[PDB]
Write a protein that binds this DNA or RNA. Sequence first.
DNA 1: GTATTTAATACTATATGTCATATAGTATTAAATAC
DNA 2: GTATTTAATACTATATGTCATATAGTATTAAATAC
Lengths: 102, 102
Amino acid sequence: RPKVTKSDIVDQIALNIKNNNLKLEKKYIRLVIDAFFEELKSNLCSNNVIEFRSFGTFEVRKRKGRLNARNPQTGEYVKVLDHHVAYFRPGKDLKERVWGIK
Amino acid sequence: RPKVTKSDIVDQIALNIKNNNLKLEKKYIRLVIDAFFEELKSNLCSNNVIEFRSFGTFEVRKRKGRLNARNPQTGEYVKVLDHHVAYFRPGKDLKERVWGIK
DNA sequence: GTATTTAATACTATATGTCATATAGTATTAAATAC
DNA sequence: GTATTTAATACTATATGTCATATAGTATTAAATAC
């Protein structure tokens, strides 16, 4: 049940990369990862669909607003407008490797 | 509706990276990205929580099975066991840049 | 690498009903590969 | 870079009810920064 950070991942990618007799400076790894997220965000804003086979797909989905909305704290009915949301849709490999988990 | 691929993203990261007077071979970019996904998957399998401050969080969630399940095609009642699923939970920046979208 | 500073998340209450789910076979198309 | 080959996705039917949602203020903590 641990909490992994962009930093840990960057370190792991460092390992993973060297395990295959390759050498890349954590510097460049951190760099790619940042550009990666930046690029993914803008891509999402443009309402594009990014697909990474064997992992998952990112896309924007529409979501109907409500009036029934509730303020968890007070119960006061709140209004929510029809908006859009970032959605990750799991790929075969990922979906199957996670299905039966302890 | 457009469709972006791991390849296009890799190219965009190439651009993004050079726009900031830096030079990294598409080779190494493709590399990081692959190790990135690899590492994220195993991290998910270990039922860890990966957090990328203001972008989103990945985590495994439990999902109750059913009997009511249906075969979209035939209507035949199907059974589904309690399992786990990969879930992406949008971060502030992402959730806000996507909210009001045409 | 470490110390400092800023701001994103976890946390929480608990009604409500939208939206992802289930299937499998065909046509695409991502993308790994060797060139 | 391009052509070839393999296998992951899009696509689709449409009942069902789980599960994410709304809020905001406090304590954490990711992580960008300059050293």
